[PDB]
Amino acid sequence: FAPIPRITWEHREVHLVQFHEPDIYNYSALLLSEDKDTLYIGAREAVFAVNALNISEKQHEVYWKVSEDKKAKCAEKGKSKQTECLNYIRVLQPLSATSLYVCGTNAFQPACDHLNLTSFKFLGKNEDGKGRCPFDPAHSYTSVMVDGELYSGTSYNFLGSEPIISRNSSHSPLRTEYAIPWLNEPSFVFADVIRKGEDDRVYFFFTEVSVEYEFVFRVLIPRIARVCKGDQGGLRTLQKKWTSFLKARLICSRPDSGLVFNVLRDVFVLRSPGLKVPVFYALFTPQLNNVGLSAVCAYNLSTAEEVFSHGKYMQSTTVEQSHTKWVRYNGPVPKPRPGACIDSEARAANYTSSLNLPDKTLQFVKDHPLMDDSVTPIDNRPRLIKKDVNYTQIVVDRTQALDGTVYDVMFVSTDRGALHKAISLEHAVHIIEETQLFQDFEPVQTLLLSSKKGNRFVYAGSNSGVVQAPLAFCGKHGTCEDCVLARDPYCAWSPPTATCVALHQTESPSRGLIQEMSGDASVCPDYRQHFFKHGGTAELKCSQKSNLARVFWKFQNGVLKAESPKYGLMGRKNLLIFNLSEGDSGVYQCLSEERVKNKTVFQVVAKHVLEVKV
């Protein structure tokens, strides 16, 4: 299990910019512009444009509030008039340079519209968002705009009994089948297009009730799925339906410890400036006995692609003679491959679209959407497993250290408004710091990263507002030792400026900078006076930031024992000399000790010169 966050930053001790509109709640949708300087917020009954560099600067505002006759219609359907019967923005996507595509629950009448960016006024397109947007603010939902066409995963109805992964195309509308083999009680988590003869694919991530597994209760299972951008459906069968829909198990577990995380919470696509293949960073929690635990598994796209392209499918079979069981299909697979895209191979066999695929192949995919092979993580284990924390959303920044060693920086939000910064150091997790983003411990519902030159920020939304944080707080570190010991690839010590700087931001010289991810503060170069009355009591204040260090006191060059009657420890860090007399005068030193590898790192926290009067 991952250790405790090395340093805890109170909302008070760091520079965090906040945004909220009075009487406006549920800041669940976040979208930043092309230029990255304008962040758009989708809340309950409102859409805003804020300066992404200072979220507190409100630029534009637009509302989409529900009428009383629509609220009462919703309430008459036994829903909560002042809770669920309101317009929760669920779809906030780029449409053009001059517009956004917006959908809201709208007292259970999913409605879509175009937000005119030049005016920040809605165009009144008033489209029926049934299938595109959920009815209930409680229902799961995911959407990705690909080539001005919305690819959405949510419920097709009011009750949330009909799930749907569909494309609102207008030219070629396509949707999933309303069948258990296709989708079995899913809870949508994330979707994105993975761009390139070879066609683009639109991946979907969700948790659904498993068909392959049987246990005491119904077992959930994380799913990775994909569809082909060029899909047009089948001609005779799969009319207006996906022909390219294949899914597989997403497995996040440490078995030598019986830890299985079968509930997917978030998915982030690490788009490597260097690496040609994207890495999905997926966030999971266990369905069973969650108390709570969180795990972060990283999946190489190539792995998943290997399953969808060459993996054996699963067959459903009748078993004695009213039951259905699912097993590996070892029978003959049709050609062209069921679920495959219109690639170079297909085009050679005179196949231009799904509309001209053989009925043999189309029937196969319709009856075999599920793959036998699981999609496994890189190094076949989670990147991080944490206890006593319920992680909510994830973002990852691939950063180059001073050394040139590349670290994948994990920003993980909690259900209590906190953000953890973690890196997988040499075969062990290091949680650099934790920051309390929300003073009200509101769970971070959404998280969004901008790693772009200048505007390097993380944006977190909750029901109470939005928070803007940098990727590091290098300046909070006082000494070179403190700067190095942090083991943050973002932070380096600058001897000329006598400040711990943010490497890859500051205008300090690279060649003349200090950073050691080993934590060996050895690479570094290197008195509060008091006058108290006789008989009186002294409180010598001492504090440090490491949650992984312990402090001890020293008087007259010896390790002082804070025991009654002469001594006491107030708050485990502040020394208390009780009965002051001639001999108590002199130097009192507060020291810290923290283990890095095998070695211990002692640091002098406080220096005190106590003088007792006569």
Binding site: L235, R236, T237, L238, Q239, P358, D359, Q363
Partner: protein, 126 residues
Amino acid sequence: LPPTAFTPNGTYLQHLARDPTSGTLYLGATNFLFQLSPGLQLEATVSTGPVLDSRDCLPPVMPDECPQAQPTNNPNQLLLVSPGALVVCGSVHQGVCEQRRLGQLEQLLLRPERPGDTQYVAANDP
């Protein structure tokens, strides 16, 4: 004078439908459709099969796309009189249906040229 029985040769009967209007009876049989008077007088006969078929294949059954197509008999799956037409669904070709003129069983009104999965009506198996 009028028949007291109807015993078609070289077939088995599946369904009967009476036209409330005219009294006309229609009979759904293996590879046959019959139109009888209310007095059981045979008025019209329509062939419904055998056809090249396979439950694994979709209509229109093309030999090049369905090499396992073999001659199949066509027991009547559904036979109902509607105000406009006689509704006819077979066991063959995925349970596809058609509409025939009432009183002119021979006259086809509607039989979709190229049907899709959403038009496979009846059980494709007797």
